Each structure stands twice: as structure tokens, then as C-alpha cells.
């Protein structure tokens, strides 16, 4: 009874296992790519994106103070 | 002896992944729940990333344009 429940969660955690390999670029379906690596890449590329989030936060901030910036010394020529 | 070093190498990547994830922040969640939220937060800061180098790519055009309306004065 537990023995069939068992093997039902077993298989729906393999699934999640490739589901998760999936999303990984290093390794979109690398079939053979065990459970180790798949949890260790997935934590480093997880990692990548949220500093990549930072990154691109500041660089959109930074632009987006050029472009105020640049709005302002438009103003003061055509009030010059 | 090898089979239980390697399980606990799971156990280990197991917790950082989880570490990782924010919406598991302080949550002794299942294995295939720290999977599922994993994979859940890939797709949404693969997303919400496009969407921010998008906005980074428009904001470079109007600078680009004001700079322009700038030099010709």
C-alpha cells in the first residue's frame, strides 16, 4: 500500500528532477546529467539570473538618470 | 564505502538550492516542492529579466534621440 504510494512519489520526483534540468542551458536535456548536478547547476545559474537582475536594475537606473539629465539640458538650450 | 557520501551531497544541494529561491525563504519544503518552486522561479526571472533589457533597449533609443536634439542646438 505505502509500497505503491512510494514508487508514485519516486516517479513524480524524477519528473520534477527533469522538469528542473529543463530550464538549466548547460543542461537542456543532457539526458544522463545526475541528480547532483542538476541541483548544483540549477542553484548557480538560479544565482546568475538574480545577479544578472541587479545588473541590469543599475544599469536601467543609470540610464534612466542620462535621460533626465539629457531632458534638462535640452530645456535649458531652447531657454537660452 | 561510497553510496552514502554521494546521498548526502544531495542532502547538502538539496538545502542550497532551496537557499536559493526566495519564495522558500524559511521553509522546510519537500524535495519536489523546492524542485517545482525552482524551476517556477527560472521561468519568472528569465522573464522579468527580458522584460528589463527591453526597457534598457528603449531607454538607450530616447537617450540616443535626446542626444541628438541636444547636439543640433
Known amino acids: ?80 | 564505502a561510497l553510496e552514502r557520501k554521494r546521498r548526502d551531497h544531495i542532502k547538502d544541494s538539496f538545502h542550497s538550492l532551496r537557499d536559493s529561491v526566495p519564495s522558500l525563504q524559511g521553509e522546510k519544503a519537500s524535495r519536489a516542492q523546492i524542485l517545482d518552486k525552482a524551476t517556477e522561479y527560472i521561468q519568472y526571472m528569465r522573464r522579468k529579466n527580458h522584460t528589463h533589457q527591453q526597457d534598457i533597449d528603449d531607454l538607450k533609443r530616447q537617450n540616443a534621440l535626446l542626444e541628438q536634439q541636444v547636439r543640433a542646438l
Open chain 1, 1 to 80: 500500500t505505502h509500497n505503491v504510494l512510494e514508487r508514485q512519489r519516486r516517479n513524480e520526483l524524477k519528473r520534477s528532477f527533469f522538469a528542473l534540468r529543463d530550464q538549466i542551458p548547460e543542461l537542456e536535456n543532457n539526458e544522463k546529467a545526475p541528480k547532483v548536478v542538476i541541483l548544483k547547476k540549477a542553484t548557480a545559474y538560479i544565482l546568475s539570473v538574480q545577479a544578472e537582475e541587479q545588473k541590469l536594475i543599475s544599469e536601467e537606473d543609470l540610464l534612466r538618470k542620462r535621460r533626465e539629465q539629457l531632458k534638462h539640458k535640452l530645456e535649458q538650450l531652447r531657454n537660452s
